[PDB]
Amino acid sequence: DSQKWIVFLLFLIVLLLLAIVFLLR
Amino acid sequence: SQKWIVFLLFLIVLLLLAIVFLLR
Amino acid sequence: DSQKWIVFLLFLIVLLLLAIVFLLRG
Amino acid sequence: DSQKWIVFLLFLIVLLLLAIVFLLR
Amino acid sequence: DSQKWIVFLLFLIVLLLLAIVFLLRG
Numbered sequence: 001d002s003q004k005w006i007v008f009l010l011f012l013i014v015l016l017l018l019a020i021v022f023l024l025r
Numbered sequence: 026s027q028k029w030i031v032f033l034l035f036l037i038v039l040l041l042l043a044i045v046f047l048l049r
Numbered sequence: 050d051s052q053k054w055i056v057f058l059l060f061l062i063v064l065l066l067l068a069i070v071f072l073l074r075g
Numbered sequence: 076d077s078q079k080w081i082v083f084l085l086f087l088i089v090l091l092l093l094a095i096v097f098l099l100r
Numbered sequence: 101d102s103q104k105w106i107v108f109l110l111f112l113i114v115l116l117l118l119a120i121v122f123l124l125r126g
């Protein structure tokens with residue numbers, strides 16, 4: 001399912017943004 | 026799936042706004 | 050439908066990334 | 076078509092992220 | 101299809117964010 005992969009990639013993007021915020025803070 | 030995408034995009038917007046505040 | 054919501058959120062993301070680019074430049 | 080606009084916005088996001096990477100590199 | 105383009109662009113975004121994290125750590 002393409003939607004499942006889209007959701008998984010968005011979750012990965014959320015994790016990467018969290019890591020970026022932690023690095024900046 | 027649409028609700029998941031909307032919720033994750035809202036989280037992304039929140040995190041990007043936090044990054045913008047951190048830069049400034 | 051949620052498609053308009055997704056489009057609006059992505060537009061907000063584009064604006065935020067533009068702001069990030071502007072802050073990085075100056 | 077909303078899918079076309081979603082793809083267009085994602086492409087703009089990719090270009091902006093590439094510009095950010097170039098600025099930070 | 102449009103779904104394939106969305107998946108490909110999200111994968112590119114993931115790669116770019118990974119590069120950003122690598123730069124921040126480096």
Ligand SMILES: CCCCCCCCOCCOCCOCCOCCO
Pocket residue numbers: 074090091093094097098
């Ligand atoms: C849609 C934007 C294009 C995506 C960026 C890819 C190309 C980035 O390279 C641009 C080359 O221009 C040279 C930049 O000048 C040196 C960088 O520092 C100047 C900023 O103050």
Ligand SMILES: CCCCCCCCOCCOCCOCCOCCO
Pocket residue numbers: 089093096097100112115116119
């Ligand atoms: C759609 C693009 C997805 C691929 C991105 C993966 C990372 C490759 O992009 C690197 C961008 O950086 C540009 C060149 O790197 C900096 C070179 O100058 C630094 C010292 O010379």
